[PDB]
Write a protein that binds this DNA or RNA. Structure first.
Lengths: 627, 112, 48, 102, 70, 49, 91
RNA sequence: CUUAUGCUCUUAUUUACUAACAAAAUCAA
């Protein structure tokens, strides 16, 4: 037989290639097992070509060197297949090999969190009663939060048409939809499946979770309710960021002022030193365990809502073909997902600071400290961790060491980890943006002290909760040898240099902060500012977004989107653009390319045809109105 | 003219052939079984099976291409496990100790 | 003998084939067992 | 069990045609060369006009019987099964093929 | 229908009996015309003190999807 | 039932534009052929070939 | 506007999946007026799939359920895959 | 050798088809 089986057996291949792309196992029930060996062999062969082209084109897109408009969407498709495969594999081997946390770890986690809440006399968040005085406003704030997506939209399809009906019907019937929400928080435990769409950012592909709108309403109410009660009862301490009290570049400014205002950091009369540490918490939200999550939320919230929160994270997630069950990781795409993450942050953080120092930072419960305070100099002085803060998942710690404490802490590291070839300065990383003179100099006793701090801290948090690695960690040391304490909190990159270590005081431009000591009112340091290279590449990726989405769009929209992107660029960090060279090159490269985009709207890239009055005159006079 | 018929029976899809100066003929199998034939007589005197990899599919154990070197004492096989294996003729082996497979024909398989 | 191919995605001649053609077995390990009982014991202890 | 290989089925159909040929000779009993050319290499065989007709009529009649046997089998195949929903004859035909695979 | 896989490839037997054209291609211009021949603060806290033949299970693939998703 | 009568017809119609148009062109081509043949017959009724 | 399922629309959807397949849900909602391809997919994967398990509770199932809901507190999509049952029936 | 409607140039209004034409985004009330 030659001609008749060729139809059938290659359709088995095409079906099996679809099942591999969809992560369906492809079991043909009675299949001659040598043929199953063949079709599995070539599909692994086609898998290797398919996965290698996905890696090859993604490096090519990040370089930004002549990728098609189609190939960007094709590569978004292949990587969102591979990300969910890595997700579905990670779900399966967790379920074969059980939870990563040992029950002794979960016992210690629970015992610390109980002790913290007992120390603060925290009364847990109740279920919202029938007669709750703030109830209609919290629903109002929630529904406006949902509406503001659609106040800026024009053209709608089915799912938001029925969504907008629900908000409007909830406006008409506040008391009906409050009773429906309280009924869902009591009873409902099974939820509709969530769709993942993943956004192109040309450097990373980020996931976006689309929730059912009836579930979105009760999420947004639960979101707005819990945050109000958490901030009312003072759940989260002062050092948990983002806070509503300040915008992030005011956070960076209060951080550097707070670095300045501790006593005797800059004094290196003795051999005393200062170490700042930056760490991601890695796969923080990816490695949250629900059985721990539910039990810890019994501490903090009435068990009905805590049951609701655990129930909502366990939903079916489907892309196009691929469907699985998120039975381990947290979904950020929920509205209330904010609240768990900061709360799960507090669980990670109380490991790091311990019971005593986190009590010393956040102060007593009746009279809490502000973001940079201690009740005395001595409570500040009694422990080397002087300043702690947490911005989402980054961690910023400040260590003040006397000579003896630094020597013990590096000797015990070298006793545990020797270095005969003195290679501690090889894997050490510092900011390649600042120049080599005023970068963190690789000098052995500071390099060994820097690793010894991190080795101390990686022990404090287990690898089952988060993955704190040295490859993501950044340590800055200030010493006799290093006058620079340099860190990156938010797209800012900050270099602090004190006044006594400036040898000569020169006037600067407005890209340099003047850090003021409080009690002398005197300028005692200078915090130089630059932009992170990441946010620079985000803005270049953003401009490529304007250019690739708008195929044959009107000219004034292209100029308008450039205005929105550039104002957003310059308003968030304004001062740091003074000092950064490659950002200025990318501003030139972007603005010329968008002017080239208008020039490609016609068939002319002539300079003489396009004087700057064409582009830069406002819309009232008939120009683009570019900035 | 047909010189000789080898004892190739039970092999299935022979991907590659290589011939030594020493009349060692190689027959790479799609089953992973690689068999060495004396070229003059057409007799299998060794049959061997490879390991696939640390982790890989059971169909991937297959030889796709092969050659001897100029000397003839090395056999280089590129296989579908994404690897290259270098097969080496075992010294310190006398006729005794390893005659190989027995010279046993059957007339039932009418190959001859 | 090869079965005929019944696909869940394509249907080039638009055939109607019954639902049984188109359309795990393990347990949880003791890691989940020991985890939940320890948390409950710690909760009972914290209650005490 | 198994199917019958094309050597055996060639032999069995060979025997069936021998038995039928023998019954034709028996019924004909109850109811009652080679020259090669010199000019060319072509060869000439003297034949009766009978038994050439009889072979041709037999081959036609066997073709008729197999045609009508399959045609009646077509009639049964589209009248037997009516459980599953279909769209055309080719749907039921292909879904009879999936029933044969079970 | 109209969208078919191949039963056979286009054979060179048919193209051999055709008459040639003698059109002049850019890559058949004379080039390389000559052959070359061979011759106490650490106490208060909670608790302190390789190749696989699978492109999807590889270590580089895990380091890929952690960086390019974020 | 009108939804069901629409669904009953859509599930039992499997071809698309290209096959239905090919059917229509094939019927119209044969109709042109049948017309042209009977023309020749009616002209042959008159004796003119 | 969120409507309830009649047994008429129930029979269209079963005949739709029988022809179109379980992945072409916008093909299914074209036949099925007033209903969504999300809603069509949701009912087939929660109600209408004949592989699903709508039957009586043996005492092994009841002892297994009270074990799983104690060991995996409030993970009903997780428990329903362990029980090989639909989820809201399991609740 | 059977003999049966010749569309007018401009402007306005209304209706039908048609462009498989286009479109409120950041932001300020």
């Amino acid at each position: 037989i030659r001609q008749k089986k060729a139809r059938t057996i290659l359709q088995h291949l095409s079906e099996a290639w679809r099942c591999w792309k969809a992560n369906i196992p492809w079991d043909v029930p009675g299949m001659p097992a040598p043929i199953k060996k063949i079709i599995e062999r070539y599909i692994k062969s086609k898998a290797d070509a398919w996965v290698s082209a996905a890696h090859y084109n993604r490096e090519r897109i990040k370089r930004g060197a002549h990728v098609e408009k189609t190939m960007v969407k094709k590569n978004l498709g292949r990587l969102t297949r591979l990300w969910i495969k890595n997700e579905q594999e990670r779900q399966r081997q967790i379920q074969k090999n059980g939870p990563e946390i040992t029950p002794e770890e979960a016992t210690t986690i629970f015992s610390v969190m109980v002790e913290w809440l007992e120390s603060r006399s925290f009364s847990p968040i109740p279920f919202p009663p029938l007669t709750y005085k703030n109830d209609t406003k919290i629903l109002v704030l929630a529904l406006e939060d949902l509406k503001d997506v659609y106040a800026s939209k024009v053209r709608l399809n089915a799912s938001e048409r029925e969504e907008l009906a629900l908000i409007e019907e909830a406006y008409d019937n506040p008391h009906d939809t409050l009773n429906r929400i309280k009924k869902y928080l009591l009873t409902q435990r099974v939820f509709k499946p969530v769709d993942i769409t993943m956004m192109e950012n040309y450097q990373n592909i980020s996931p976006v979770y689309s929730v059912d709108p009836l579930e979105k309403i009760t999420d947004a109410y639960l979101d707005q309710y819990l945050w109000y009660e958490a901030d009312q009862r003072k759940l989260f301490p002062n050092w948990i960021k983002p806070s509503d009290s300040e915008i992030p570049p005011l956070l960076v400014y209060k951080w550097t002022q707070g670095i300045n205002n501790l006593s005797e950091i800059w004094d290196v009369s003795r051999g005393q030193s200062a170490v700042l540490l930056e760490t991601t918490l890695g796969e923080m939200a990816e490695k949250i365990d629900f059985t721990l999550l539910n039990r810890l939320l019994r501490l903090i919230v009435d068990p009905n809502i805590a049951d609701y929160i655990t129930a909502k994270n366990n939903v079916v997630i489907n892309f196009k073909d691929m469907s699985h069950v998120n039975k381990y990781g947290l979904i950020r795409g929920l509205k209330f997902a904010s609240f768990i993450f900061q709360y799960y942050g507090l669980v990670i953080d109380l490991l790091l600071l311990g019971q005593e120092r986190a009590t010393d930072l956040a102060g007593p419960a009746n009279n809490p400290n502000e973001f940079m305070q201690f009740k005395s100099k001595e409570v500040e002085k009694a422990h080397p961790i002087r300043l702690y803060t947490r911005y989402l998942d980054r961690i910023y710690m400040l260590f003040h060491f006397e000579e003896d404490e630094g020597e013990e802490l590096t000797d015990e590291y070298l006793a545990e980890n020797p270095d005969p070839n003195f290679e501690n300065s090889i894997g050490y990383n510092n900011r390649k943006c600042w120049p080599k003179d005023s970068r963190m100099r690789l000098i052995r006793q500071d390099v060994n002290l820097g690793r010894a701090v991190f080795w101390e801290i990686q022990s404090r948090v287990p690898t089952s909760l988060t993955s704190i690695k040295w490859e993501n960690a950044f340590v800055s040391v200030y010493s006799k040898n290093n006058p620079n304490l340099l860190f990156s909190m938010c797209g800012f990159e900050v270099r602090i240099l004190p006044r006594q270590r400036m040898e000569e005081v020169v006037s600067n431009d407005e890209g340099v902060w003047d850090l003021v000591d409080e009690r002398t009112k005197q300028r005692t340091a200078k915090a130089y500012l630059k932009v992170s290279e990441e946010e620079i590449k985000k803005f270049d990726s953003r401009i490529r977004g304007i250019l690739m989405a708008s195929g044959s769009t009107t000219f004034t929209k292209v100029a308008a989107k450039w205005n929105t992107s550039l104002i957003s660029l310059f308003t968030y960090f304004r001062e740091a653009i003074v000092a950064t060279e490659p950002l200025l090159d990318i501003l030139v490269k972007g603005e010329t390319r968008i002017q080239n985009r208008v020039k490609l709207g016609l068939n002319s890239k002539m300079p003489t045809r396009f004087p700057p009055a064409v582009f830069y005159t406002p819309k009232e006079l008939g120009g683009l109105g570019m900035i | 003219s047909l010189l000789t018929n080898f004892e190739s029976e039970k092999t299935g899809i022979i991907n590659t052939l290589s011939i030594n100066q020493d009349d060692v003929l190689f027959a790479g199998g799609d089953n992973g079984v690689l068999s060495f034939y004396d070229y003059k007589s057409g007799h299998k005197y060794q049959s061997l099976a490879t390991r696939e990899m640390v982790g890989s599919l059971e169909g991937e154990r297959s030889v796709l291409c092969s050659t001897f070197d100029k000397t003839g004492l090395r056999l280089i096989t590129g296989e579908a496990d994404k690897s290259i294996k270098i097969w080496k003729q075992d010294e310190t082996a006398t006729k005794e100790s390893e005659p190989g497979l027995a010279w046993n024909p059957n007339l039932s398989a009418k190959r001859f | 003998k090869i079965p005929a191919a019944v696909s869940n995605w394509k249907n080039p001649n638009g055939y109607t084939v019954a639902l049984e053609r188109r359309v795990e077995n393990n347990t949880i390990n003791d890691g989940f067992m020991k985890l939940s009982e320890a948390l409950e014991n710690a909760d009972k202890k914290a209650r005490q | 069990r198994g199917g019958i290989s094309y050597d055996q089925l060639a032999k069995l159909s060979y025997e069936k045609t021998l038995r039928n040929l023998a019954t034709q000779t028996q019924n004909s009993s109850k109811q009652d060369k080679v020259q090669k050319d010199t000019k060319t290499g072509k060869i000439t065989i003297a034949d009766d006009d009978k038994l050439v007709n009889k072979l041709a009529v037999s081959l036609q009649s066997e073709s008729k019987k197999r045609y009508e046997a399959r045609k009646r089998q077509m009639q049964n195949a589209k009248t037997l099964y009516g459980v599953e929903s279909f769209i055309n004859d080719k749907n039921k035909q292909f879904n009879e093929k999936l029933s044969r695979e079970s | 229908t109209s969208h078919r896989p191949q039963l056979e490839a286009r054979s060179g037997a048919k193209a051999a009996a055709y008459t040639p054209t003698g059109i002049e291609h850019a890559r058949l211009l004379p080039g390389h015309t000559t052959l070359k021949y061979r011759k106490s603060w650490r106490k208060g806290t909670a608790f302190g003190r390789g190749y696989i033949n699978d492109m999807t299970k590889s270590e580089y693939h895990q380091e890929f999807l952690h960086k390019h998703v974020r | 039932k009108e939804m069901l009568a629409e669904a009953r017809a859509r599930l039992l119609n499997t071809q698309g534009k290209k096959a239905t148009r090919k059917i229509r062109e094939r019927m119209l081509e044969e109709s042109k052929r049948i017309a042209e043949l009977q023309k020749r017959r009616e002209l042959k009724q008159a004796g003119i070939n | 506007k969120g409507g309830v399922w009649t047994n008429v629309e129930d029979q269209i959807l079963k005949a739709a999946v029988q022809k179109y397949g379980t992945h072409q849900w916008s093909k299914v909602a074209s036949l099925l007026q007033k209903k969504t391809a999300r809603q069509s997919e949701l009912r087939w994967n929660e109600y209408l799939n004949p592989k699903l398990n709508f039957t009586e509770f043996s005492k092994e199932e009841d002892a297994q359920l009270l074990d799983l809901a104690r060991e995996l507190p409030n993970q009903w999509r997780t428990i329903a895959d362990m029980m090989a049952r639909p989820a809201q029936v399991c609740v």
